[PDB]
Amino acid sequence: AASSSLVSESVVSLAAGTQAVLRCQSPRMVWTQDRLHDRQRVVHWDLSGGPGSQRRRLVDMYSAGEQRVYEPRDRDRLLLSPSAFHDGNFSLLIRAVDRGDEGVYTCNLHHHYCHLDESLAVRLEVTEDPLLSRAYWDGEKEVLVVAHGAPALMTCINRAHVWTDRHLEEAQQVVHWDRQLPGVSHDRADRLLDLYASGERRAYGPPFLRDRVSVNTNAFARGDFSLRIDELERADEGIYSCHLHHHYCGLHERRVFHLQVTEPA
Amino acid sequence: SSSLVSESVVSLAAGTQAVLRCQSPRMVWTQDRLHDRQRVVHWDLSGGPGSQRRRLVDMYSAGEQRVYEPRDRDRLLLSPSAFHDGNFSLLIRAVDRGDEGVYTCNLHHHYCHLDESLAVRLEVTEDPLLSRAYWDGEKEVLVVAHGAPALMTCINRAHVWTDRHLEEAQQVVHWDRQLPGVSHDRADRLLDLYASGERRAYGPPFLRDRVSVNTNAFARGDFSLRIDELERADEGIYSCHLHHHYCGLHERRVFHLQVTEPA
């Protein structure tokens, strides 16, 4: 993979002399990352439905939570590893497979903080001849042939750091504001501000614009890095971009503002 | 068909009583049926000639599987219906270095007194591309990545282990007689002894009165043929055939009987 990005784009038209507020806020921009609530992951196993019908959720488990089975008959029957989010082993164990367990299973990982979705499909087939039990690749997914009544383990492993409870060093979060003046292509944007979570601001370029640009650094703690431009001039027109790279999530966040300054009649 | 257990020559005087010994404790049948289809599977773990085997998990037929180490609960699993289809394989949910060793799957039949076992050696590696299943010459060897599952296969679909009913052909003992000149296959049946108690004697009354097996044959497993008042016409090849179809017991004993007249 090269990059994963969350991008939002907006058109802003404001009268000259008024104030511009370019809102840039995200839970990723909250520096003190709660290892509990900012690390909520969920795994759930789904089973294919009937012809053209809806899938059925069998069991799910949130990180730092206990597994939940949705059919009371399947309690103590479908098992996840309680250490799944520590080692990255999200495999599903069926204690005794019957015909009602045949179908295509999906193992689904969701990172609610990092906006990451992962899915793996496994087809389970029940045989009444134990000699025919086997596992093979069908061209797109693993196929597991299991003797009726036997336990079956469908393997789902993802050991990437974002799914496990392994944490690298929490480095400094920096938020960048860029600007493209009218008629300047992308990749040639000029930096406007570097905004550090600890409160430091590094200004760039024009001293005739810096005096009207401001941020509220007391709102950095809640992930708000919005840009404020006072006394809007025609020269303020352009494409403003707020962007951040989140190391743990492996995620680029980008908010783009096409700002137009009008003049009253 | 059957296994020929012995073939002996018996020479006796006319007028005496022949006793052709045919005994088997595994042909005993009595009134009671105290779990006479009771089986048990158990998996053991051992580690070389100088280590002690440890019982891992067992399960009786018509019972629930019991695991011996509380850590292994929900970790070592058998098919709860293993005795229906003969799938006695053992699933280790996730293996570690402590699971290395030789695993033996043991079947034991409390009624038939049968035992059958196979061994599997588990080896836990670190590289997943080194994971293979091969035959070392006398047992299967499983190389499994750490934390991966290990399915140690133990499949025995024979009717004696499974809840499949091959009708109910009970124990029966046959005594046959092959007279001189008579070719085999055309040997005359002398006695049918069924475990249920039914007996079938063959021949004219002069012969049936002189040929007997003790009345408690199946209680004691003694089916010896007694021939009273030996005549020269009694000589020939006698054969005892023991059949326990459920337990797979099929034995025969052959007696070459010679009758010598007093001079």
UniProtKB/Swiss-Prot annotation, chain B:
Disulfide bond positions: C22-C105, C154-C240
Keyword annotations from UniProtKB, A to Z: Cell adhesion, Cell junction, Cell membrane, Cell projection, Cytoplasm, Disulfide bond, Glycoprotein, Immunoglobulin domain, Membrane, Nucleus, Phosphoprotein, Repeat, Signal, Tight junction, Transmembrane, Transmembrane helix
Q: Provide the residues annotated with a glycan attachment (glycosylation).
A: N87
- Consequence the record notes for mutating D222E: Reduced integrin ITGAV:ITGB3 binding
Q: Where is this motif: RGD 2?
A: 220-222
Report the membrane topology from the UniProt record: Single-pass type I membrane protein
Q: Which conditions up-regulate this protein? A: Disruption of the blood-brain barrier by cold injury results in a drastic reduction in expression. Up-regulated in primary chondrocytes in response to BMP2 and PTHLH/PTHrP.
Q: What is the effect of changing D99E?
A: No significant effect on integrin ITGAV:ITGB3 binding
Extracellular-side stretches of the chain, per the record, are 1-263
Q: Does the keyword Flavoprotein apply?
A: no
| Description of how the protein assembles with itself and partners | Homodimer in cis. Does not appear to form trans-homodimers. Interacts with ITGB3; the interaction inhibits ITGAV:ITGB3 heterodimer formation.
What the protein does comes down to:
Transmembrane protein which can modulate activity of various signaling pathways, probably via binding to integrin ITGAV:ITGB3. Mediates heterophilic cell-cell interactions in vitro. Inhibits osteoclastogenesis downstream of TNFSF11/RANKL and CSF1, where it may function by attenuating signaling via integrin ITGB3 and MAP kinase p38. Plays a role in cartilage formation where it promotes proliferation and maturation of growth plate chondrocytes. Stimulates formation of primary cilia in chondrocytes.
**Comment on protein domains:** RGD motif 2 (but not RGD motif 1) is involved in integrin ITGAV:ITGB3 binding.
UniProt protein name? Matrix remodeling-associated protein 8
- Tell me the organism: Mus musculus
- What gene name does this entry carry? Mxra8
- State start and end of the fragment within the whole protein: 32 to 294 of 442
